[PDB]
Amino acid sequence: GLFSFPCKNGRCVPNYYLCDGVDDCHDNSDEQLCGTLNNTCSSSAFTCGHGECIPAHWRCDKRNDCVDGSDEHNCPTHAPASCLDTQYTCDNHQCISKNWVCDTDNDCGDGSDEKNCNSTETCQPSQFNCPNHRCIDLSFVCDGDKDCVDGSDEVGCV
Amino acid sequence: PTCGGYQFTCPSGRCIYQNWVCDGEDDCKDNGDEDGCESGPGYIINHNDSRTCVEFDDCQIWGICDQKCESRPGRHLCHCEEGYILERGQYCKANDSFGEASIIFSNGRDLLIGDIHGRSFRILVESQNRGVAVGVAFHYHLQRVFWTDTVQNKVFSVDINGLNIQEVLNVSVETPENLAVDWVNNKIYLVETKVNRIDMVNLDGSYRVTLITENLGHPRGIAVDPTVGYLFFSDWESLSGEPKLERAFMDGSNRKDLVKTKLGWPAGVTLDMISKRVYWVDSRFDYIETVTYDGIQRKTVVHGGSLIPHPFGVSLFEGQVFFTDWTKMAVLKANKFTETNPQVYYQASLRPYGVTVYHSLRQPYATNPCKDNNGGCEQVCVLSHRTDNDGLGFRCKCTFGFQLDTDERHCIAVQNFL
Numbered sequence: 001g002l003f004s005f006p007c008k009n010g011r012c013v014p015n016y017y018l019c020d021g022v023d024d025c026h027d028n029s030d031e032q033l034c035g036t037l038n039n040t041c042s043s044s045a046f047t048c049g050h051g052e053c054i055p056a057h058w059r060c061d062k063r064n065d066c067v068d069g070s071d072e073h074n075c076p077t078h079a080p081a082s083c084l085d086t087q088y089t090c091d092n093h094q095c096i097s098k099n100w101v102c103d104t105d106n107d108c109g110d111g112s113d114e115k116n117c118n119s120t121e122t123c124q125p126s127q128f129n130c131p132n133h134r135c136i137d138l139s140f141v142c143d144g145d146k147d148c149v150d151g152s153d154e155v156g157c158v
Numbered sequence: 159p160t161c162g163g164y165q166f167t168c169p170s171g172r173c174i175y176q177n178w179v180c181d182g183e184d185d186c187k188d189n190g191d192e193d194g195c196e197s198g199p200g201y202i203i204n205h206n207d208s209r210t211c212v213e214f215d216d217c218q219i220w221g222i223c224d225q226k227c228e229s230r231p232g233r234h235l236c237h238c239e240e241g242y243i244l245e246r247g248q249y250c251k252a253n254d255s256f257g258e259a260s261i262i263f264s265n266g267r268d269l270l271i272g273d274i275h276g277r278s279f280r281i282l283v284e285s286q287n288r289g290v291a292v293g294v295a296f297h298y299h300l301q302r303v304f305w306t307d308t309v310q311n312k313v314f315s316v317d318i319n320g321l322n323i324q325e326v327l328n329v330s331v332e333t334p335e336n337l338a339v340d341w342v343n344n345k346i347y348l349v350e351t352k353v354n355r356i357d358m359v360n361l362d363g364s365y366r367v368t369l370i371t372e373n374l375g376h377p378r379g380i381a382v383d384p385t386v387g388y389l390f391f392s393d394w395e396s397l398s399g400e401p402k403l404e405r406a407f408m409d410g411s412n413r414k415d416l417v418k419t420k421l422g423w424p425a426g427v428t429l430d431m432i433s434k435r436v437y438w439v440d441s442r443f444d445y446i447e448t449v450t451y452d453g454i455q456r457k458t459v460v461h462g463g464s465l466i467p468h469p470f471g472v473s474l475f476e477g478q479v480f481f482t483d484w485t486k487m488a489v490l491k492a493n494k495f496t497e498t499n500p501q502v503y504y505q506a507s508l509r510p511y512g513v514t515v516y517h518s519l520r521q522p523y524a525t526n527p528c529k530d531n532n533g534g535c536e537q538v539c540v541l542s543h544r545t546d547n548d549g550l551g552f553r554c555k556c557t558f559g560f561q562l563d564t565d566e567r568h569c570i571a572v573q574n575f576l
């Protein structure tokens with residue numbers, strides 16, 4: 001149609017997806033051969049130095065998405081913000097539930113939820129206790145998930 | 159041999175059905191059956207004795223010798239095999255003749271190779287197009303390193319230097335987690351978690367065959383022992399919701415659960431071929447255990463939440479085991495027998511997935527029965543247990559679109575499948 005961008009494979013696509021950053025047409029034609037003066041990339045398509053347009057999700061990811069490195073050439077300050085009392089602030093400023101803290105689980109990418117947990121040999125009030133294993137969440141006590149190696153959870157769950 | 163490949167050898171010398179190894183009944187009068195499946199000392203010590211030190215037992219101590227132990231009447235001899243230089247009378251370090259071992263691991267995106275001592279860490283290959291490397295495997299004789307990329311849905315091979323990157327599979331491998339390389343038969347064993355199947359291909363991807371898919375729910379680890387013709391893999395969530403670390407012949411003929419106790423999330427599997435043991439890490443329960451090839455003498459190497467919070471992959475070499483942990487995002491290092499504190503061999507910002515030790519000893523040479531004119535097979539010659547197939551040790555399997563003929567060596571076109 002008039003508002004549908006034709007593609008090399010024969011499929012059609014709305015002209016919005018043309019240079020939007022993602023190849024909505026499965027032949028990549030909507031993003032292929034774009035970035036020129038006539039081929040104005042969309043706002044969602046973060047253009048790099050050599051007309052290298054990448055999705056806005058790739059604005060400042062750790063991955064060097066484009067060879068020019070404009071995704072990594074400049075990056076703004078993060079959003080520190082804050083978290084609730086129940087939430088735990090991980091080093092990457094991610095709010096994390098207390099039960100997810102110290103559970104031998106990389107629940108928040110940086111892993112600070114589990115950083116320096118051996119200092120205490122007991123368990124949290126909201127976390128059940130698997131002596132041989134860990135301080136699993138109290139929800140696991142009777143959830144059918146024998147998280148405790150000893151099977152301390154799922155005991156007396158009538 | 160008198161005892162069959164799919165049978166457990168009693169001390170008396172009688173073969174026992176493989177599922178009976180830890181069935182729960184002492185089928186072996188010698189009590190060899192059910193010999194300490196559960197995971198729960200000294201010499202000069204005189205138990206209730208003034209000076210009568212306990213005789214204990216020669217070469218019966220977990221960790222007495224890094225390798226085969228020669229039992230002496232009042233002492234022990236820590237014998238070391240070929241290519242292994244004895245050290246301190248208790249450790250079997252490698253022979254300097256072979257080059258230094260290399261710990262090939264994935265930081266989370268790129269594939270890194272470093273010296274076993276950890277002095278330097280160069281990048282063997284960087285995954286492109288936003289891809290990430292997950293599993294690693296190598297063929298030392300050909301100096302090739304194989305790694306899978308789940309994001310790119312491709313499997314790549316490269317030279318040890320970091321050149322001549324080749325693409326072996328990119329058709330249907332959407333999420334290949336781990337790999338195992340049969341150096342003896344030049345076969346690659348692949349674990350595909352997208353459709354929960356285990357496929358075996360040549361080093362060039364010439365022939366593809368799916369081997370084990372009866373009840374795979376979430377395969378996570380794989381390991382092959384070409385010398386004995388075995389195949390070990392782990393599933394952390396089967397179809398029946400039952401994790402099943404399983405031993406099977408290389409062709410997946412006699413499937414048999416290996417560990418049936420305290421198996422939370424069996425993630426990684428590695429084989430100590432010298433001591434004939436299976437080392438598997440559990441991400442859920444937080445423990446790296448060790449049982450024999452028959453799953454008999456279960457030993458807990460490292461346990462505890464803090465020490466090993468969330469292991470994914472483990473590789474063994476000499477008296478050291480290298481296991482990667484997701485929670486700590488580090489390639490930790492531990493003793494083969496028992497370690498009270500993991501050693502941080504390397505740490506990465508991303509979660510490491512693969513780990514292997516690149517060394518000649520890791521892949522001992524052995525005869526390949528398929529060398530005899532492709533084992534007489536019209537198509538893929540797959541090795542099996544040495545005892546299997548009248549002792550020939552190999553089976554004929556047909557690629558996709560072909561069916562084994564009555565002779566079991568030829569391949570006719572397929573007829574009917576739903």
Ligand SMILES: *[C@@H]1O[C@H](CO)[C@@H](O)[C@H](O)[C@H]1NC(C)=O
Binds near residue numbers: 240242243253254
């Ligand atoms: C170790 O390698 C050397 C060659 O460098 C060889 O002569 C020797 O037999 C090998 N094994 C032992 C046990 O030294």
Ligand SMILES: *[C@@H]1O[C@H](CO)[C@@H](O)[C@H](O)[C@H]1NC(C)=O
Binds near residue numbers: 325327328329
């Ligand atoms: C896989 O890679 C080979 C070699 O580059 C190539 O010839 C083939 O077309 C590729 N197939 C897919 C599915 O990408």
